[PDB]
Amino acid sequence: TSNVVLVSGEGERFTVDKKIAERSLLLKNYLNDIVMPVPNVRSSVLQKVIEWAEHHRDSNFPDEDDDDSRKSAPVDSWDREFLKVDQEMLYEIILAANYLNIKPLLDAGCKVVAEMIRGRSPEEIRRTFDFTPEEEAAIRRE
Amino acid sequence: NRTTQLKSKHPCSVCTRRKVKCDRMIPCGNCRKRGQDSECMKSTKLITASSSKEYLPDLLLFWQNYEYWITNIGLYKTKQRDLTRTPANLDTDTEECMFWMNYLQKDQSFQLMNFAMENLGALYFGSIGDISELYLRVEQYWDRRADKNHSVDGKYWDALIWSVFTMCIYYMPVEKLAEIFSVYPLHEYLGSNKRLNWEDGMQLVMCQNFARCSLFQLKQCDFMAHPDIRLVQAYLILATTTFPYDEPLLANSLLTQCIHTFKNFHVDDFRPLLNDDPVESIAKVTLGRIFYRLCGCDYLQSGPRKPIALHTEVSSLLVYREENSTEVLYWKIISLDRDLDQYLNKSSKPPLKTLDAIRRELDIFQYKVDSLEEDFRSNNSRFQKFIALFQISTVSWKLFKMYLIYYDTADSLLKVIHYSKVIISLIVNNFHAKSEFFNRHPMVMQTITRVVSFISFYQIFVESAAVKQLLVDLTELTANLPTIFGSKLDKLVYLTERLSKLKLLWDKVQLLDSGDSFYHPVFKILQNDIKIIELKNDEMFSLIKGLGSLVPLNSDFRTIVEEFQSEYNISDILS
Amino acid sequence: KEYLPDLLLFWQNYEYWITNIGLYKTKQRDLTRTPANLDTDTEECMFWMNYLQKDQSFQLMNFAMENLGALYFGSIGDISELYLRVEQYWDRRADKNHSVDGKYWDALIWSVFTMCIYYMPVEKLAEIFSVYPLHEYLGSNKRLNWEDGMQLVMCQNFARCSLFQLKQCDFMAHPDIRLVQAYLILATTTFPYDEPLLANSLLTQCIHTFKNFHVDDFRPLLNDDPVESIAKVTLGRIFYRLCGCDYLQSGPRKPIALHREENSTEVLYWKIISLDRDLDQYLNKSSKPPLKTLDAIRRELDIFQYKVDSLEEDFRSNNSRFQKFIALFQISTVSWKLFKMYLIYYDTADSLLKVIHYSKVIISLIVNNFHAKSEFFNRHPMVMQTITRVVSFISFYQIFVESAAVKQLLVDLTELTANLPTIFGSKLDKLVYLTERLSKLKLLWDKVQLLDSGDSFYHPVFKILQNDIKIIELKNDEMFSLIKGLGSLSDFRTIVEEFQSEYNISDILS
Ligand SMILES: [Zn+2]
Ligand SMILES: [Zn+2]
């Protein structure tokens, strides 16, 4: 198996196996016509993506289009430990994957963020107010 | 071109206190006109980042209309006429086709058929099927020369084989063509320059003369007096060359004749029912193939010079009753193309669920086109692979262009650059030996015209180095497309060249302001070109000229506009 | 006697297939034996244009201007202006190079010349032309005079010359409105019955060239150049006339549908033909139009009856009498079809009396034209269609219900049929044959006892009438042409086969 070449946004040349790089559908459509560039992606982010793809190279995720019907199904512990980073790195993971068209990582990351959303304290949600300043006081009345 | 940015939820309290409409684009297009800026802004959210490009979204929405009335209609599908100077067809092309049927000889035609059987199969197989049986018909033509009485059916077979001869002459590489034919009596007859070789332009001349002699035989058939399937077959053979772009209203008239000839049969369903002749079932399957190829070559001649839509009940939103053999999946691509490009001359926005379904069908078709194996020596299967992958590339490009314009999703522009590089790669990979003529299909002219026009238009306003290198790539590619696009290719050059000059007019003159909308000569020239071509396609003047003796008789900003229109006129894209 | 209503419902279907489709709109062909015209009528149209002279053409135009107004006003209005074009014709005769627009004008005036040759009565027609070079060229019998058939021959050759000039124009490459003008000149004669599918092809060219202009509304505006208003009113004329000539050619060989002083008469004609469409949209469908629809059609028919009775005429203005004739004949024909559908679907009291009444009205309208200076009034194809419908339903109702008034009426129809003018030619003969066939179809209903199954009935006349429909529906499929185009691919029965062996149906087809 000849290996393929990805280029990050920072100019780094990554080299990886074909059968794990074909997890990203952009690379699949690109090589079914080897260097492919991936801009807007920090090099650590692309390395995290290639690590996550090499971990699940023989996994099985449901399905193709029964997705939001079969989801929700809870996420495995290795991926949640993998995505236990600060939030700017997380949004960079999600945007880079949405460029790379990897849907199961996208669903896993969105489940993490939605877990952060669905679950906030009541004291958080009492902030940031509506383009009516005067009517806000009538809302702030009670 | 209305200014905009940062859509600002509520209507502002200034515009509500005075009871006018509130353009919410921050702060207003109205408060900025008066000079009341501190009132509308300084309530909440004092976050400013003056990007100085607030003229961009309505400009990008204007690109929709400019693509629709320049790149589509006004370059390919437009032809002005002069009824008082076009000469009458007094010879009726009798001398012309007399000579250009005394030219072609027998073994030459057999070598043409050999090349056709070898290398062109994915064109005519959807129409007629086997070609070698058709050799017999060729035999019959060469059996029936010196006779003085001919059947209607025989001249129909002759018209079909001359259309296939025209497809051969169009798609042949110049070395084999120089092996087979000779040159010298063509310059003895026509009267062009006596050193014009086959790369010089005689290929296009001989191709158009063969298509004209095919139509001459169809005229000897009295083809409007006998509806038969061979008119439809000869048209679908001729509808892969540039004959849909030489005489476009003649093509529209012949296509209407073919629509009538198909609808004569009153066939609605194509699946063979349980209680029929096997001959009837074979006939209805062949009819299904010809109907889908007809719907394709009917959609690719839309516009205002052809009103009769065939297009009966065909969609792919949330056709299915068919076998995905080759022609149904060739149709589904163009159905998705129609479902995207119905929004050019509209004024509404397609929702999210539509484009998401289009993205999912795009993935399915990518999967089940790349999921086919073949033989490497099978040249025809490679060429079918080229056509299917080029079409799916073009549809992906238009999809993310519409994403970019209507909603500007995450990193849309670089995706457009990505698929543009893919299209460039698919032509440059075919620049090598033995696969040269693969760049002679009309869909590459369509896709290259769309790409170079959007990249020049986006070059004029917003600059990045990747976009500039991409434009250099496109210019390098357009410099070496094959010469059989001929004069059409030259006019595409002119259009891009005009846009290059329109960059300089963005530079040497400052953008003005009026508080609400902007003003610049480039906007007026841009919206002067669409007005000139929409004048050129209102047929009321020919109507008044035809009904009888009713003869119709009707700052330095303006100086700059009229100087640029005096030097670089739009009306040189016509002929 | 319960067999009557289902037999009446069978009459609708038999009328739709045999009378309309079969006798007029069906032409079989042999693509293997039909000679492809390598000459392309060059010798033929060359001779029929070297024959015609100049002052003869002016006399043709004089008869056209005086006595033909209510046909060409719907398309081209004034014709004296067109005199100038005629001059240009003889001014551009012996030239060596030509144009496109001049050839379109020549095609229009040749179509008008075809109409002039067609509606000319035999006296002046003999006064103009000779007969001798016609038999020097064609070589038929010298005694063949103009009433013998040379009128129809010269009419069809001038129609052929007009289509020859339209094919010199390359008319599929220069779509102008004069194609529509030449076609709506030619579509008033019986040229849509010589070559029906060629006429369908030309009509589809006309629909294409019309929708090439993109004009929906024809109402003029204050803020327009009045040249545009003149053009939009002219286009409104040509649109409604072309929709009428659409409805005259429905069926299975044309599947591309379209839907002050004298303009009110044009609106009158269109509303007549639209009510005709509203009636005859029930032939081949199995639907029964209800009573409310028939009552509304009757009330509107009374209103248009009053409006046509509110018209006027003048005995020297022969065009006014011809216009009155056409309008009254149309209103009578639609009235007859209304009460025929009354009789068949519902059988109201004195439905039959109204059928007999309007039948006598139609007979009087045709017979009263037999005076001098009123012959050519009969040469319009709507009376041919109407006579066919009337005499077929009279014979069909004669066979199964017998009455002395109806029998005298059928004798009147049969007496009237043999005195229609010669210009329908062989087509006329075929209608006679149909009537004669129905006469023999009476006799078989006489000498045979009707059987009974307890539920349904049996008689050979039923099987003969059903076999004719199935034979012509077999002749109305192009599947055999498709296969030839793709590649190289009790004594009941005895009586039925004896009658079908003697009186075949294939004589009514071309
Ligand atoms: Zn406001
Ligand atoms: Zn404001």
Author numbering:
A (entry chain D): 3 to 35, 75 to 170, 175 to 187
B (entry chain B): 3 to 320, 334 to 569, 588 to 608
C (entry chain A): 55 to 313, 336 to 565, 588 to 608
What does the publication say?
The centromere is distinguished by the presence of nucleosomes containing the histone H3 variant, CENP‐A. In budding yeast, centromere establishment begins with the recognition of a specific DNA sequence by the CBF3 complex. The ~445‐kDa CBF3 complex consists of four proteins: Ndc10, Cep3, Ctf13 and Skp1 present in a 2:2:1:1 stoichiometry (Lechner & Carbon, 1991; Doheny et al, 1993; Lechner, 1994; Strunnikov et al, 1995; Stemmann & Lechner, 1996; Russell et al, 1999; Espelin et al, 1997). Both Ndc10 and Cep3 are capable of directly binding DNA (Espelin et al, 1997; Purvis & Singleton, 2008; Cho & Harrison, 2011; Perriches & Singleton, 2012); in the case of Cep3, sequence specificity for the CDEIII element is provided by zinc‐containing Gal4‐type DNA‐binding domains (Strunnikov et al, 1995; Espelin et al, 1997).
Interestingly, the Ctf13 F‐box/Skp1 interaction present in our structure is significantly different from all currently known examples, with substantially altered positioning of the helices in both the F‐box and Skp1. Our structure also highlights the function of a previously unresolved loop between residues 105 and 112 in Skp1 in forming inter‐subunit contacts. The quality of the density is sufficient to visualise the Zn2Cys6 cluster, assign the correct amino acid sequence and the build the likely path of the loop connecting the domain to the rest of the Cep3 protein. By superimposing the crystal structure of the homologous Hap1 domain (King et al, 1999) bound to DNA on the Cep3 Gal4 domain, we can trace the likely path of the DNA. This modelling clearly shows a severe clash between the DNA and the LRRs of Ctf13, indicating that this domain is likely incapable of DNA binding once the complex has formed. It should be noted that we obtained the core structure without pre‐treatment with λ‐phosphatase; therefore, the presented structure likely represents an inactive state of the core complex.
